[PDB]
Amino acid sequence: NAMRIGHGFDVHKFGENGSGPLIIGGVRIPYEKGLLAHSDGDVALHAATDALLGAAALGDIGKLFPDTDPAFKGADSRGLLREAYRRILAKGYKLGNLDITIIAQAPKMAPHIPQMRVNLAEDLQCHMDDINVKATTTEQLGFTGRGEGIACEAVVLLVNV
Amino acid sequence: NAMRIGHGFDVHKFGENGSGPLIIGGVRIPYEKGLLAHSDGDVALHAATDALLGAAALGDIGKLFPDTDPAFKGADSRGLLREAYRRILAKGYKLGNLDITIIAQAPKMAPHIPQMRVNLAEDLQCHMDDINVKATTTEQLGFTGRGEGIACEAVVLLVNV
Amino acid sequence: NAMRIGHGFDVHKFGENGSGPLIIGGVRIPYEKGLLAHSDGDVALHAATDALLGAAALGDIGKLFPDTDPAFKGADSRGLLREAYRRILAKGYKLGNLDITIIAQAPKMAPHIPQMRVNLAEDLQCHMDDINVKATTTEQLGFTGRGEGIACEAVVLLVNV
Ligand SMILES: Nc1ccn([C@@H]2O[C@H](COP(=O)(O)OP(=O)(O)OP(=O)(O)O)[C@@H](O)[C@H]2O)c(=O)n1
Ligand SMILES: Nc1ccn([C@@H]2O[C@H](COP(=O)(O)OP(=O)(O)OP(=O)(O)O)[C@@H](O)[C@H]2O)c(=O)n1
Ligand SMILES: Nc1ccn([C@@H]2O[C@H](COP(=O)(O)OP(=O)(O)OP(=O)(O)O)[C@@H](O)[C@H]2O)c(=O)n1
Ligand SMILES: [Cl-]
Ligand SMILES: [Mg+2]
Ligand SMILES: [Mg+2]
């Protein structure tokens, strides 16, 4: 079977005005709060990993890396992504292309998108043209608009090698 | 045209502490409330049906099965899915693969995912490897995090027969 | 590379009981409020444009048409869509198919869907069978259910010409 589709969706709640600031798409972004989570809280990498595992019918991140397991407290999401991708390659698939939509009232994602694409293209061993990332606001509506957290949605295509 | 993409999204509000407990992905899940709806309220099957009808440019579930029509009060969502799939086959398409993301603060979906995949693979007459299901929390943010309802998002690929 | 996937997501907040009523999918829909936005606020066309640009790894609408730029105040979203599609064709891709899910408590989208599909098929120079549009409610949950805005989600497939 030639191609497979995958979808990922992930949310994190902000901490308080201590938090050690954002990592999104492997990029450290300046901000007054960070996202609370078992690992580094990288919403964009989580959504992307799930899209990949989902396309491969491998479940999701929780399947591969139990949230219960203390070996992943503060785990680097880029490492989790690379491991999942390794498994996807093992199963005979490689990335066709990926598209990510970050949903956050703030901070601005646009300055960091090029580096995010760099990190992803590295991690998924492909050309940067196979990675798209956008960011969008929720016009101050709902919990993202209220600034209580950031959500991220990802969509992916795997090609059979 | 070789392949077609489809997306589905569906939400249901919980009832009170009577409700007759969850059906999700055709699986009856133990819980203090059920989801109010015209049919059985199976959010995951609704999202999946819409993804399929959407890929086929057949509209959505409301198009095929009027919500107004009393013949579908408490309708089995698996039956609705099978009917839609019948129509998709009629139009010359079959499932490539499906991926589903349930968004619910509770109860835990993970124990039921294998059976959900069984029901879907049966319904869409395919191998279980063409079905992925994940569940995710919203970290207690928004109406799902607040426990007022469950949302579900589905993505699908149809292949031309 | 044969096919590319894209995802779009967009939200707009309603104005007050002046607002000059809805445009969605290029269709003017009767309503007591309109959606506030820099351009015409057409959530469905925005989500679709982003899905297209995202599949093409061209970023999103903000990339092509700065929100800062006064040349796009009240810009027609259909025009923005046509420009983006022009760029996608330039890059060697054409629409495979598109699917859109409008998320709105009200007004009813169903009466307008056929015209929306007409506008899109015109804009993306394809057959209406390559366009699907659905609408869904959020059962009065969250900010859409509360009627403070409308959200829209789009998914797309590009084929290499
Ligand atoms: N956290 C965020 C959110 C948005 N953006 C940028 O702002 C643009 C869109 O933001 P938004 O206010 O959500 O735009 P629209 O909803 O499309 O506004 P309009 O109705 O005027 O088209 C995006 O392309 C993105 O580059 C960003 O950098 N960081
Ligand atoms: N109703 C739910 C919600 C979640 N899960 C399980 O819990 C995992 C993820 O839950 P969540 O708390 O949403 O995880 P993350 O947001 O990814 O947490 P982290 O930041 O620590 O990675 C999933 O893989 C799923 O198996 C579940 O069984 N039932
Ligand atoms: N703003 C809206 C929202 C919904 N609809 C129509 O109503 C149907 C579904 O609405 P909804 O109440 O969201 O349906 P379900 O959630 O699927 O209800 P049920 O549980 O009974 O299946 C759709 O197919 C659509 O045609 C509409 O015209 N305009
Ligand atoms: Cl909310
Ligand atoms: Mg984490
Ligand atoms: Mg129902």
Ligand SMILES: [Mg+2]
């Ligand atoms: Mg606008």
Ligand SMILES: [Mg+2]
């Ligand atoms: Mg909400």
